[PDB]
């Protein structure tokens, strides 16, 4: 069941991309927002295509989401990031 | 606002990616890949408020229409996405 | 890559320049930063489209030219952080993409 | 520094994309992995060029996908598959160095 993780990724993308634009000492949040939005997209694609690397991609996505949430924590972004990390860890297990 | 179009793009991505894997039809496979890729780009454009959002959506609609025509579930999602993208692109 | 090798190269060069500019600008530049991200991303897509003989390659190249033209215009308003180099690479890429798109 | 790894990723993208189109004109596993590998190589390039804080982790992933793509394409003797395998294995080795 990947529907819930896909939704969390999509929500995280949205929040990270909005935070990126609004932010534009925020250089760290901007960098992470870009990388997080990019890895979330990759995780969505991996889950939608049934990729053999879906779990590894999800694990990476969690790590990036956690870092992005820590740095933005911007508060909406941090929340969506931590939720997405949790869902990606579950998928990765 | 863009939530409905984003949702249609995401549904189209899902359907095109599922069709790509199941087909693996060479025309459908090629278009499935391109359509999924342009849907993802349209999602990003809407989420980042890109100045090229309308142009990207227009392109996305064209590719979705072609993908739907060739695949014609995927076809259904494609035509839905095309119409939502045309509305955004106006 | 008989007909696309040059345009591919210009897109690869533009990606490099835009990504470099993005990072340097981050260390009044917010418009350049945004466009650098968009332009690097579309250039990567155009490369993929050309390499895979994708049926929308010409349309993708036309979009790439438009985004490159805009990125070049915005980066061209700044005189450090690799912005003038980025503008040049953008304009080169736009011209090559317009040829491919024909 | 990343120039050599970038170059290997760019070469691997080229080979995977070429292999994808040639295979489409028992190759379904190669076609799938060609798509994923070309895509991750593009991401690794961006990560290196933008000095992204997860560049090392992305390079590690890119190595794993490259190794799998090479292993699968390496089972076939036309459609640019052997060339694709070689470029995949080269890339993987450069990415592993960058990921350290």
Numbering used by the authors:
A (entry chain C): 4 to 27, 34 to 82, 89 to 108
B (entry chain D): 4 to 27, 35 to 82, 91 to 108
C (entry chain B): 2 to 28, 34 to 108
D (entry chain A): 4 to 28, 34 to 108
Task: Paste lines from the article.
The Csp3s are the cytosolic members of a new family of copper storage proteins. Both the M. trichosporium OB3b and B. subtilis proteins form tetramers of four-helix bundles possessing many Cys residues pointing into their cores, and can accommodate up to approximately 80 Cu(I) ions per tetramer. The number of Cu(I) ions a Csp can bind is dictated by how many Cys residues it possesses, with 18 and 19 respectively per monomer in MtCsp3 and BsCsp3 compared to 13 in MtCsp1. The Csp3s can bind copper in the cytosol of bacteria conferring the ability to grow at elevated levels of this metal.
